[PDB]
Amino acid sequence: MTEYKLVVVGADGVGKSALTIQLIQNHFVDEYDPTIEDSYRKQVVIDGETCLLDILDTAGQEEYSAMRDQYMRTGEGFLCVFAINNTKSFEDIHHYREQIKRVKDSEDVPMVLVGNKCDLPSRTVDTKQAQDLARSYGIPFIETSAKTRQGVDDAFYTLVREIRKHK
Ligand SMILES: Nc1nc2c(ncn2[C@@H]2O[C@H](COP(=O)(O)OP(=O)(O)CP(=O)(O)O)[C@@H](O)[C@H]2O)c(=O)[nH]1
Ligand SMILES: O=C1NCCc2c1[nH]c1c(-c3ccoc3)cccc21
Ligand SMILES: [Mg+2]
């Protein structure tokens, strides 16, 4: 069975855990329980292929930044999440991309830019500005909501397709 190693990264509070738990369990976590590092293994069918998704839900708290080196070496694709109402999380994206590129020693790492919390009216990052950043990196961009499930399956399945197409 083809196995895909996905890593969910981004600033503290953007909704990494809520996105992962929505994808796998189909419900929304309202509480904010900061992550150290959790992992999940889930079988899914993507484009008629039974896939094993190995999903690593990482820490956004900068206190755990030394753990990034290990997961960036082993991860095959990265879901780079910011929240549409948190401009600092959007600026933090570039730092995660640069770190991943350095650890892999490559500019062609499978990645998807995710603008989460798109259900909220408190937007601070225009969709066009995020589209422009994703175009500069050569990666897909999707807006998501862990509350409504908008874009959630597409974000994860697009990342699988980016890994599959790169190999
Ligand atoms: N309205 C809304 N709230 C969201 C969304 N995704 C997450 N949240 C909320 O944001 C808060 C943080 O979510 P969480 O999933 O813990 O974020 P995280 O990025 O994993 C936090 P850490 O980096 O510390 O592990 C929670 O209150 C959660 O309900 C979303 O799409 N919409
Ligand atoms: O190497 C592994 N052996 C088998 C079990 C396993 C391995 N990596 C995993 C990850 C993961 C994703 C990105 O990096 C690591 C997530 C969940 C389970 C994993
Ligand atoms: Mg978390």
Curated annotation (Swiss-Prot):
Keywords: Acetylation, Cardiomyopathy, Cell membrane, Cytoplasm, Deafness, Disease variant, Ectodermal dysplasia, Glycoprotein, GTP-binding, Hydrolase, Intellectual disability, Isopeptide bond, Lipoprotein, Membrane, Methylation, Nucleotide-binding, Palmitate, Prenylation, Proto-oncogene, Ubl conjugation
Outcome, altering residue 34 to R: In CFC2; characterized by a defective GTPase-activating protein sensitivity and a strongly reduced interaction with effectors
Result of altering residue 14 to I: In NS3; affects activity and impairs responsiveness to GTPase activating proteins; characterized by a strong increase of both intrinsic and guanine nucleotide exchanged factor-catalyzed nucleotide exchange leading to an increased level of the activated state
Residues involved in GTP binding: 10-18, 29-35, 59-60, 116-119
Subcellular location: Cell membrane; Endomembrane system; Cytoplasm, Cytosol
Pfam families named in the record: Ras
Membrane topology value: Lipid-anchor
Positions carrying N-acetylmethionine: 1
Enzyme class label: hydrolase
InterPro entries for this protein: P-loop_NTPase, Small_GTP-bd, Small_GTPase, Small_GTPase_Ras-type
Reactions catalysed, as given in the entry: GTP + H2O = GDP + phosphate + H(+)
EC annotation from Swiss-Prot or TrEMBL: 3.6.5.2
N-acetylthreonine sites (modified residues): 2
Regulation of catalytic or functional activity: Alternates between an inactive form bound to GDP and an active form bound to GTP. Activated by a guanine nucleotide-exchange factor (GEF) and inactivated by a GTPase-activating protein (GAP). Interaction with SOS1 promotes exchange of bound GDP to GTP.
GO annotation (BP), single: Ras protein signal transduction
Glycan attachment points: 35
Motif (Effector region) on chain: 32-40
Effect of residue 5 to N: In GASC; found also in a patient with Costello syndrome; exhibits only minor alterations in its in vitro biochemical behavior compared to wild-type protein
Alphabetized CDD domains for the sequence: H_N_K_Ras_like
One CC-aspect GO term: endoplasmic reticulum membrane
Disease: Leukemia, acute myelogenous: A subtype of acute leukemia, a cancer of the white blood cells. AML is a malignant disease of bone marrow characterized by maturational arrest of hematopoietic precursors at an early stage of development. Clonal expansion of myeloid blasts occurs in bone marrow, blood, and other tissue. Myelogenous leukemias develop from changes in cells that normally produce neutrophils, basophils, eosinophils and monocytes.
Quaternary structure and interacting proteins, as annotated: Interacts with PHLPP. Interacts (active GTP-bound form preferentially) with RGS14. Interacts (when farnesylated) with PDE6D; this promotes dissociation from the cell membrane. Interacts with SOS1. Interacts (when farnesylated) with GPR31. Interacts with RAP1GDS1. Interacts (active GTP-bound form) with both SHOC2 and PP1c (all isoforms) to form a tertiary complex; SHOC2 and PP1c preferably bind M-Ras/MRAS, but they also bind K-Ras/KRAS, N-Ras/NRAS and H-Ras/HRAS. Interacts (GTP-bound form) with MAPKAP1/SIN1; inhibiting K-Ras/KRAS activity.
Function per UniProt: Ras proteins bind GDP/GTP and possess intrinsic GTPase activity. Plays an important role in the regulation of cell proliferation. Plays a role in promoting oncogenic events by inducing transcriptional silencing of tumor suppressor genes (TSGs) in colorectal cancer (CRC) cells in a ZNF304-dependent manner.
Record-given protein name: GTPase KRas
Record organism: Homo sapiens (Human)
Lineage, broadest ranks: Eukaryota, Metazoa, Chordata, Craniata, Vertebrata
